[PDB]
Design a protein around this ligand. Structure first.
Ligand SMILES: Cn1nnc2c1C[C@@H](C(=O)O)CC2
Length: 119
């Protein structure tokens, strides 16, 4: 019932994501010189270094807020892809399945900890 445990769990999951070859297109903001029309389609850019920095600055209040920003990395890739069979989009799908499989217990444990505290 540790209410704060999600933070280190999320740091460790981000470490696994940064080791994954599938995360390379998403580690830093999308290069606007390489994709000149990117901001014509994407309203809110997001990347894993921004998620890690926000976590490390103490600017997430819960793992749900972190999960919303990671999900935005994946929804931006899906909105920007010219094809659902593109290389970078295909990497985003695999990485999203890996993230979702690992974040489930972090969210469950955090919510259980809040419920125990409320009692
Ligand atoms: C920068 N980026 N993020 N997601 C994607 C891309 C490139 C896009 C394309 O290949 O034109 C496919 C999906």
């Amino acid at each position: 019932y540790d209410i704060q445990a999600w933070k280190k769990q999320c740091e460790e999951l981000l470490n696994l994501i940064f080791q994954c070859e599938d995360s390379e297109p998403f580690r830093q903001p999308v290069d606007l010189l390489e994709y000149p029309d990117y901001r014509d389609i994407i309203d809110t850019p997001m990347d894993f270094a921004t998620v890690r920095e926000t976590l490390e600055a103490g600017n997430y209040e819960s793992p749900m807020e972190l999960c919303k920003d990671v999900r935005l990395i994946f929804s931006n890739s899906k909105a920007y892809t010219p094809s659902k069979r593109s290389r970078i989009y295909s990497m985003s799908l695999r990485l999203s399945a890996f993230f979702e499989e690992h974040i489930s217990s972090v969210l469950s444990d955090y919510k259980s900890a809040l419920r125990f505290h409320k009692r």
